Amino acid sequence: ELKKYKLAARKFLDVNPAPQDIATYGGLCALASFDRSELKQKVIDNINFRNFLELVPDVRELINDFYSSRYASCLEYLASLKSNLLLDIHLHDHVDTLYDQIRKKALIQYTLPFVSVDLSRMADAFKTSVSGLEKELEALITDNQIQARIDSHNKILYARHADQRNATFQKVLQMGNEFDRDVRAMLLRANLLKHEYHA
Amino acid sequence: MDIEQKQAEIIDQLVKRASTCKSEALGPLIIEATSHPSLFAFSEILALPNVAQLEGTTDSVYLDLLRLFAHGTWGDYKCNATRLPHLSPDQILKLKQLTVLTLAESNKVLPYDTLMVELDVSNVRELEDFLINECMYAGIVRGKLDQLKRCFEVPFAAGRDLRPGQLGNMLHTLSNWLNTSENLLISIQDKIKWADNMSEMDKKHRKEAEEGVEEVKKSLS
Amino acid sequence: NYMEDLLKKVRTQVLLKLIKPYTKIGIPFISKELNVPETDVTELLVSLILDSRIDGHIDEMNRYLLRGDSGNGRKLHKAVDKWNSQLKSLSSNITSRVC
Amino acid sequence: MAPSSSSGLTFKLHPLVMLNISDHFTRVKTQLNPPAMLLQNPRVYGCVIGLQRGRTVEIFNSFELIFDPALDTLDRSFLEKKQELYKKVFPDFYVLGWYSTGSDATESDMHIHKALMDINESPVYVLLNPAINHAQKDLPVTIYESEFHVIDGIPQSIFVHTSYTIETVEAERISVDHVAHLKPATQLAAHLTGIHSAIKMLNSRIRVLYQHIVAMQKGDKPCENSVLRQVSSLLRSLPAAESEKFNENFLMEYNDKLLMSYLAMITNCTSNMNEVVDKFNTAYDKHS
Amino acid sequence: TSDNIFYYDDTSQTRFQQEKPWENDPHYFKRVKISALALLKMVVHARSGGTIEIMGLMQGKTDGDTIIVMDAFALPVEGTETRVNAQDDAYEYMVEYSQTNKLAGRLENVVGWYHSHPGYGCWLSGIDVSTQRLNQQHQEPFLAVVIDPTRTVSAGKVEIGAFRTYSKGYKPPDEPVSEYQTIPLNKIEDFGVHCKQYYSLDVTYFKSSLDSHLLDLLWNKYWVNTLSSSPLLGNGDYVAGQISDLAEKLEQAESHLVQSRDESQLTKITRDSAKITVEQVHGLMSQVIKDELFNSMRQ
Amino acid sequence: MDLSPVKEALAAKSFDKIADICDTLMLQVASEGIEYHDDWPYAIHLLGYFYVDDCDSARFLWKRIPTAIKERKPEVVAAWGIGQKLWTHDYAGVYEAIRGYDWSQEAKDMVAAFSDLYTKRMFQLLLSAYSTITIHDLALFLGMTEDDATTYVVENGWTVDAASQMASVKKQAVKREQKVDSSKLQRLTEYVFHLEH
Amino acid sequence: EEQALVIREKLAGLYESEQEWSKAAQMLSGNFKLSKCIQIARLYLEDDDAVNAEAFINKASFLVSNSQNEVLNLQYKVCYARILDMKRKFLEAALRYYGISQIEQRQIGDEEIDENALEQALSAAVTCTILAGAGPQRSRVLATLYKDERCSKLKIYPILQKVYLERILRRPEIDAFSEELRPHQKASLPDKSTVLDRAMIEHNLLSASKLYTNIRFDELGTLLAIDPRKAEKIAANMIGQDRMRGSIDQEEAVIHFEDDVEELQQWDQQISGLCQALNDILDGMAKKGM
Amino acid sequence: VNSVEAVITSIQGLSGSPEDLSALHDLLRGVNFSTLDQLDASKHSLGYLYFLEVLTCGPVSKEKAAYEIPIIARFINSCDAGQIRLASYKFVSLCKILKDHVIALGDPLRGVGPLLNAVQKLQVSSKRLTALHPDVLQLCLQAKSYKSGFSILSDDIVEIDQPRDFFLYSYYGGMICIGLKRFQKALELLYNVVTAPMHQVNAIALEAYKKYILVSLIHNGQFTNTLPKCASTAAQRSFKNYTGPYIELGNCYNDGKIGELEALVVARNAEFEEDKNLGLVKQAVSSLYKRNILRLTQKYLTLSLQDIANMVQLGNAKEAEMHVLQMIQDGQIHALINQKDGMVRFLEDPEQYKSSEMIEIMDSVIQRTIGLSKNLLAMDESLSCDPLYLGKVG
Numbered sequence A: 001e002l003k004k005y006k007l008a009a010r011k012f013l014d015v016n017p018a019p020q021d022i023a024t025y026g027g028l029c030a031l032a033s034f035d036r037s038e039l040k041q042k043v044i045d046n047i048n049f050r051n052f053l054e055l056v057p058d059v060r061e062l063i064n065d066f067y068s069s070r071y072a073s074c075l076e077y078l079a080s081l082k083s084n085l086l087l088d089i090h091l092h093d094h095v096d097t098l099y100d101q102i103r104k105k106a107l108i109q110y111t112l113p114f115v116s117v118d119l120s121r122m123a124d125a126f127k128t129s130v131s132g133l134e135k136e137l138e139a140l141i142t143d144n145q146i147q148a149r150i151d152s153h154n155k156i157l158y159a160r161h162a163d164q165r166n167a168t169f170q171k172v173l174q175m176g177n178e179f180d181r182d183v184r185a186m187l188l189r190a191n192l193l194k195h196e197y198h199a
Numbered sequence B: 001m002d003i004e005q006k007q008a009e010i011i012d013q014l015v016k017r018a019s020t021c022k023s024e025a026l027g028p029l030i031i032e033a034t035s036h037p038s039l040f041a042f043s044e045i046l047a048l049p050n051v052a053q054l055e056g057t058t059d060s061v062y063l064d065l066l067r068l069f070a071h072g073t074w075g076d077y078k079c080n081a082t083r084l085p086h087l088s089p090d091q092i093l094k095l096k097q098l099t100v101l102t103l104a105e106s107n108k109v110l111p112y113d114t115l116m117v118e119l120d121v122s123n124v125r126e127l128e129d130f131l132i133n134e135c136m137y138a139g140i141v142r143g144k145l146d147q148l149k150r151c152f153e154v155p156f157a158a159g160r161d162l163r164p165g166q167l168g169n170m171l172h173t174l175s176n177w178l179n180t181s182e183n184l185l186i187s188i189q190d191k192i193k194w195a196d197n198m199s200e201m202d203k204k205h206r207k208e209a210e211e212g213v214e215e216v217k218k219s220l221s
Numbered sequence C: 001n002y003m004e005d006l007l008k009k010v011r012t013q014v015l016l017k018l019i020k021p022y023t024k025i026g027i028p029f030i031s032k033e034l035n036v037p038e039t040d041v042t043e044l045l046v047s048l049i050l051d052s053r054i055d056g057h058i059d060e061m062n063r064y065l066l067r068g069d070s071g072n073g074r075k076l077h078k079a080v081d082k083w084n085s086q087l088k089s090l091s092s093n094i095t096s097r098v099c
Numbered sequence D: 001m002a003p004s005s006s007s008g009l010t011f012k013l014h015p016l017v018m019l020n021i022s023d024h025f026t027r028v029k030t031q032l033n034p035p036a037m038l039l040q041n042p043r044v045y046g047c048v049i050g051l052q053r054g055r056t057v058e059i060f061n062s063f064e065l066i067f068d069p070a071l072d073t074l075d076r077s078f079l080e081k082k083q084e085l086y087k088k089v090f091p092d093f094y095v096l097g098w099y100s101t102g103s104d105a106t107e108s109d110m111h112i113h114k115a116l117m118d119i120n121e122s123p124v125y126v127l128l129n130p131a132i133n134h135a136q137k138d139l140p141v142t143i144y145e146s147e148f149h150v151i152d153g154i155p156q157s158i159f160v161h162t163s164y165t166i167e168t169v170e171a172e173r174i175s176v177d178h179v180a181h182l183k184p185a186t187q188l189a190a191h192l193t194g195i196h197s198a199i200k201m202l203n204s205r206i207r208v209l210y211q212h213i214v215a216m217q218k219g220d221k222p223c224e225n226s227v228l229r230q231v232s233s234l235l236r237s238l239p240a241a242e243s244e245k246f247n248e249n250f251l252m253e254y255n256d257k258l259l260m261s262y263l264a265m266i267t268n269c270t271s272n273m274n275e276v277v278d279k280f281n282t283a284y285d286k287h288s
Numbered sequence E: 001t002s003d004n005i006f007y008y009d010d011t012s013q014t015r016f017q018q019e020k021p022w023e024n025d026p027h028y029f030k031r032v033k034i035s036a037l038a039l040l041k042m043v044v045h046a047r048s049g050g051t052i053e054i055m056g057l058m059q060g061k062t063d064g065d066t067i068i069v070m071d072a073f074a075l076p077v078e079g080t081e082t083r084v085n086a087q088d089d090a091y092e093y094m095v096e097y098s099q100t101n102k103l104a105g106r107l108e109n110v111v112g113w114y115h116s117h118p119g120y121g122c123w124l125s126g127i128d129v130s131t132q133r134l135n136q137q138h139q140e141p142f143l144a145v146v147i148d149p150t151r152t153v154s155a156g157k158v159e160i161g162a163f164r165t166y167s168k169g170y171k172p173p174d175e176p177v178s179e180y181q182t183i184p185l186n187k188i189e190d191f192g193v194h195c196k197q198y199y200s201l202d203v204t205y206f207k208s209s210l211d212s213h214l215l216d217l218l219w220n221k222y223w224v225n226t227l228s229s230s231p232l233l234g235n236g237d238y239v240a241g242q243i244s245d246l247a248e249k250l251e252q253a254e255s256h257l258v259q260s261r262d263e264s265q266l267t268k269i270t271r272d273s274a275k276i277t278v279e280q281v282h283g284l285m286s287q288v289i290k291d292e293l294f295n296s297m298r299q
Numbered sequence F: 001m002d003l004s005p006v007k008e009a010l011a012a013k014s015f016d017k018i019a020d021i022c023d024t025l026m027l028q029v030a031s032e033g034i035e036y037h038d039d040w041p042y043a044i045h046l047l048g049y050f051y052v053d054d055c056d057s058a059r060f061l062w063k064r065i066p067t068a069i070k071e072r073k074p075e076v077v078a079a080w081g082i083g084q085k086l087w088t089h090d091y092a093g094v095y096e097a098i099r100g101y102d103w104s105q106e107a108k109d110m111v112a113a114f115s116d117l118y119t120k121r122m123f124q125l126l127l128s129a130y131s132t133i134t135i136h137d138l139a140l141f142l143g144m145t146e147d148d149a150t151t152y153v154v155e156n157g158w159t160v161d162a163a164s165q166m167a168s169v170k171k172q173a174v175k176r177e178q179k180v181d182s183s184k185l186q187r188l189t190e191y192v193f194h195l196e197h
Numbered sequence G: 001e002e003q004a005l006v007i008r009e010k011l012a013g014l015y016e017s018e019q020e021w022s023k024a025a026q027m028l029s030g031n032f033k034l035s036k037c038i039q040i041a042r043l044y045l046e047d048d049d050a051v052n053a054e055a056f057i058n059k060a061s062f063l064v065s066n067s068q069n070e071v072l073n074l075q076y077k078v079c080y081a082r083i084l085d086m087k088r089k090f091l092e093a094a095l096r097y098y099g100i101s102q103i104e105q106r107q108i109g110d111e112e113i114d115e116n117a118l119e120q121a122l123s124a125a126v127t128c129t130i131l132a133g134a135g136p137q138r139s140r141v142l143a144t145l146y147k148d149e150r151c152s153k154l155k156i157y158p159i160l161q162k163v164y165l166e167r168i169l170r171r172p173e174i175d176a177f178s179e180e181l182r183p184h185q186k187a188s189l190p191d192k193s194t195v196l197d198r199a200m201i202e203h204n205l206l207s208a209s210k211l212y213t214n215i216r217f218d219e220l221g222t223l224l225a226i227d228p229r230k231a232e233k234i235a236a237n238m239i240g241q242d243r244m245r246g247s248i249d250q251e252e253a254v255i256h257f258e259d260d261v262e263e264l265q266q267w268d269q270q271i272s273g274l275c276q277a278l279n280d281i282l283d284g285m286a287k288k289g290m
Numbered sequence H: 001v002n003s004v005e006a007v008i009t010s011i012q013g014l015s016g017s018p019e020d021l022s023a024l025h026d027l028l029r030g031v032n033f034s035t036l037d038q039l040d041a042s043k044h045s046l047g048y049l050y051f052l053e054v055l056t057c058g059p060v061s062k063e064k065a066a067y068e069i070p071i072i073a074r075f076i077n078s079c080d081a082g083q084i085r086l087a088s089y090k091f092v093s094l095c096k097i098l099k100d101h102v103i104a105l106g107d108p109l110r111g112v113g114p115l116l117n118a119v120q121k122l123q124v125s126s127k128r129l130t131a132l133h134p135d136v137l138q139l140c141l142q143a144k145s146y147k148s149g150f151s152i153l154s155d156d157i158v159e160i161d162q163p164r165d166f167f168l169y170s171y172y173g174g175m176i177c178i179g180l181k182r183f184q185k186a187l188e189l190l191y192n193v194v195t196a197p198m199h200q201v202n203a204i205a206l207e208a209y210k211k212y213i214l215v216s217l218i219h220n221g222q223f224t225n226t227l228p229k230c231a232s233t234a235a236q237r238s239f240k241n242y243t244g245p246y247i248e249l250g251n252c253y254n255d256g257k258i259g260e261l262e263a264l265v266v267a268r269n270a271e272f273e274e275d276k277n278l279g280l281v282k283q284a285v286s287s288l289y290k291r292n293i294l295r296l297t298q299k300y301l302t303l304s305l306q307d308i309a310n311m312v313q314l315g316n317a318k319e320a321e322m323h324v325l326q327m328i329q330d331g332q333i334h335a336l337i338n339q340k341d342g343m344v345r346f347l348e349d350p351e352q353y354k355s356s357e358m359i360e361i362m363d364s365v366i367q368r369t370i371g372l373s374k375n376l377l378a379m380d381e382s383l384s385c386d387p388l389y390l391g392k393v394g
Ligand SMILES: [Zn+2]
Pocket: E080, E081, E115, E117, E123, E124, E125, E128, E146
């Protein structure tokens, strides 16, 4: 246990009664779990804690760049500090999964605003081959997080939008048939028990 | 309706004189009658018996001019543009307005392509300028103009005088509407009576249910 | 210093009114009216959308802002789905007790 | 008589004004005469409120007003008091004219009418005729309009007649039929009968116009081409919508209602399925 | 007869005031007559009030066990369902309006107050009964008219309702029955607590000779409106509420069914579902009739 | 036996009802006891099921084929050859089997009409499942030669590139028709009555 | 004081006659109270030197009586015209001229105050109402101005109607209106492409919304007589200020003049019009024919 | 017999179906093909059956088998509806002997037709499950007559006469659907056998389960490892013991490993062939290729033919195109293909639910639910009038 992200970061920040450890972690784990509003409240609107964040200017700059859509710079900074970050027990225990979570968060934040995302730009933006990012996108969409369909001809990520009305009609008609068949199976099962009780 | 009384005052003056003019005086009379930018119906002058005896004399061109305005179009005029006398710009403008009315009689959404052929214009802007300043603002029609689909809707349009061969269709069109209204009467009545029959049959049937078990309860008690 | 705070509040204020009477605004058009390089226009526009200030989305391929269209009846289509799901559960439980 | 109005505005009356004026005349007469020959049918006065957008003058409500018998005019102190109170409850309605009960407007009302030009310079004058006659076939009311002329040099503001329409909301429709045909059926018959009566009224008029035209077709019926033009203009709009845009939406609504009907039936079946199964269990006990 | 309902008789009205026969039993009044003008005025004001409640007062006389209501007027008071005895805000308005109207044609005293519940019932809430308790304590004749402006548009008729408050402590040994009403899940709690404190009264509708003549002529020019109108015009959000509101009741019934295992939230829910679907289908029937009669065919 | 209805249907060119005629008559023929394994129009029965797209029942019927008559007449062997291609979805192979052993005068037309129907059915699949198809495969699926396949498609609107030898597919057009139901109020009234118990 | 002013104004009057209104204004400056104030104001207003005279007229207006034949109202109206130059007092001024219009028609001395003055005031009142923008009250006074009167004979009639009845005003007509509009050269201010240009294009775009349902941006240039970019600019802020109703698109470069309702509500309007025409045929023939 | 001589006259005389014939039947209850040959057929009714039963009482077969079988066909076809309706076990014994005649004389199809006609007349209500239903189902299935025997299979049967006859009706009825490419109804009938009350395990119960899983994989595309709740307690505790090899097939199908499925079938080919299932299992072998391509529909919008083959491990380009073309024919997918680039485009469902055709589909479903309510209501009335129900509740 005790391997969560948001609750663990909140507990680590809320220390009842060293200073480098307080400056480190914290918002790094919060960004892996907290959404945009929560991260903004806990970092930008946390001047009491942002005073400690000033002691670590690189971490605050990376957090702002993530908030300011500067994925390349913060990703490069984290990669450079990856060897140093995973050398302080707290991150040494689990660093790869945390970095993976930051990566996935970066992707989902990237594809959220646009409708016609271009995968070629994200390739050099994230410093990954088109095939690798394609496989990552398959993994994400198969989890039903990035609601979109990947066009594999011109490498365009056309966003997917539902129609609701057409989806509702298909779901209701399927429900009725399932209810219809079960009720007919209800009558036959009842009569068999009636026949047995007579004997 | 609002366009009807506007012609009604002018028609009375026109018919009153036309009933008394000599053979020659109708000549100038028909020219102004078709040129007044209020009058759109002319069969009353046509039905007036004086013009009946005019058919045959040298003024026969005037009568065919009236028949064109009574029931005719720009396409009809171009075919017979030789015999018919030359028209002043005011007369041509009046007949262009009558072009829209005839097409608005048998349709409600007028495509752009049909309008260009009949009205003889070149581009979209020339056609739209004519519609705004000569059809809608004159009160003859009342619609909306679309540009993406290139169509002009005509909800309200004043009808024209009947050409020979329309009164028979009017009775059939009216009678067909009457039958649809009448057949909707007994159709509604049957649905109401259907509800009563099913309700009464059901209440008699459920009544046989508890009476069946009422005997059962006392039999085994 | 205070310029960064001073710059933004002026920038977003004119931008919000600029795209209000528009269903598909052009990214180069916003750059030319506001006299700002298109790169900064894009960065400002996406950041505004992530704050839910803007309603629509931006076309990366064709440089357009697909503002969300008028919302048709959706709560009715949302409610029937909740009606459908509850009806699924109740019908399954009713039948599955005779055994 | 009074000629037609050349202003071009359209007036939209409301039934509220109708019931208010009739009730005012009822209360006064029923108490002047000994309740246990009511002199001369008395008359009342008041003002009508309403807003105006573009070229449409809309009338919604009205309030009463005491007529001053000393100076033969309308006292201003009461008018100010009533106007102030109504502005608190109705914050968008301003005075548009005055009402009275009578048969025909006279020049004496013009002197009074000149007093109300201070507020809403060109007001209207709605007049109600309370003479109960069974031979009439429309609401006994005329809406007059102030008209500034130059007849013979003298201003001579002459009252002229205007055209009005009794525009009503659906909510007023429900209450009107509830009180008019007060019950001395179920739900399906009641709903269909309302449409059934309306079509019956429609069918009679179509027949009446049909007889005149067929008489024109073969009978004597000297030709009246004026009605023919209006008939053709009427007849060239029967298909109403007649568009693929309407058909897509009309069939869309038809299937939406059926979907609710389908789910409504299953809820009824589920309710009917419930209690029968317990009757099965309490009779053929599974615990056995 | 048709004009005998009028003529407020002061020398006759004061006769009932001194005897005070309603002090002993609260069941004295069993009839509430409502004039034609009053009902029309209450409906229009309530319908134009939107989704927020309104408030107003009506004036009338009394005779025997019937409380006649003659006319009603509005009052600019906001939130009548929240603040008890909220009419005190416009007390100066009530004095001025009654005083000013006394000169021309108005003589009847103010009887009761009316509000407009917008689409969740035709009942009296816990706040409503408390306000009527004080008014009944001071002035013995006091009614409470509640009308619904949405359901009036919805099915076929005005959703009117009159009530009178029982005295505190007086427990009615009758347990009268009442018609079932559909209540949203956020208002059922108030209804359950207060159910034997507001006995209802019958409602009729009278009119005068002049009123009956105008209404007969007015209705003959309504066939156009009965056809060229679609009541299902803005009912896209209203219908979404009940369909959504039916879900939790089904969810609660399902949750209660598994724990244990009119009928508890099963037959009532079926009534509510039918009460929603039938009105929509009734509206569809009108559309089909208008479709065949007008959109017939080209030739 | 009384094979007249089978003969009458063949004479009347009722190929659609051919399959239904034999099975109904076969049940009555077997019941009485008249021998049929060497008299019944067995070849005609198999080909009738192919016309109305019941290739499944044709498989069981061929499994009930007498062994001797398989070795006796080649028409029944040739008839089953077409069925093998239909079962295996060999779209091009059907035309080879159809143009095989010389059909006798009896099955004359009953095969030509069926072959014509297959081409019509095959065209609908190509129209609804293709966008760009080379003329080489167009001739294979549709059946005729390259020059004939190119000519046929352009009469239906299908345009073909003259350089890469490929045709582009379009969905032609649609129709309007009508509804003419008039049974609308009656159905609605039934739902309302049943809804309110 | 008064004696010195009378003598000085006498020299000013002689100067004013001999094309020296500038000298007249200096000399004169250097209902008895109203008459003295009006005499100074009239010369000041004529030479556009109302400074130090409008206040003097206003100061004397407190003690100004009425007597008989008070032309001080006309001077105040002329002062209101100077007020309407910048303060935009045309809304009050237009109702003022209507007072001095054929409304006060009588002998009234001579024809200079009962025949020509009313005609000029009637024409002036029409112009001022056009100058003002928005104005639900301006729409109200527009109703009575068009309401019979002599405006049909008036030369500005075309404009009045095209303004009153929402109609598309062509560019050649608005040029004549602006060309004739030279009361004090302040109404035709050239400040940032004037305000009439902003007023006229506002009205022309307003009238086109009812007449259309959608329009491409290119054809929005032919009408309104302006480049497409400028037309897009004004259409943007007009929608932003909730003046008209519509939406804007760029890929097709069209503006959707929605300003309507659902086709079901449009369908109901056709049915109501269908039944309404049926009644008029019977009512029109029953009342008139028989 | 002496009374038989008067009975022959009574056959053409004292009819009285529910009187004279009733008395005659009672008397009989309490020839030699010579007098019976002179008797009637329709008027005799129970008398003709009694003579037929007495004449067929002997154990003679072969030569006697051929004579009576042709004779019984004439009587069965020319049988009065009323006489057949009142016929007890006596009737079904005659039909049961008729089948045995055909299965021994030769082809079972020889008497399939006459046997089916007996069910039509003897059936009183469409809801009656006659004891003859499993009798004709076995004959038509064995005689390679799947098309003919499917007409009897209905969906309004709600009443159970003999519990064994219901299991045989459902089991044999399911086998008809599977071979006729009717997987939709095949699941329904086979679903009832497992979901039926039974104290202990039964042979038919296990055989229905094996067919259910493979049919589910072909149509649905998954294997639910959990038995439905509405099933007998005995089935839940023990049903996997005898379905070991079948269970492993479903788990592999859920994953998507084509290699394991292609190897498991061959590795355990002995067990599957023993239960005559190997023919049907191979139908589920090729269903994985159709399923994986269907999964890509909700994951892409345009893909190349070569990539499709690599993703599903299919083969060359023509293999990928052929599978797609077959899928479009069935309707499991809506796609368009092009050969300039060798690509496949995944479209969406053209259905709009805004057409007059949807009204008829919706209306038919509505009318089916209305009929469903009546069946529930009729169940209520019979139970409410059941004397056992009142006593327990009283
Ligand atoms: Zn309340």
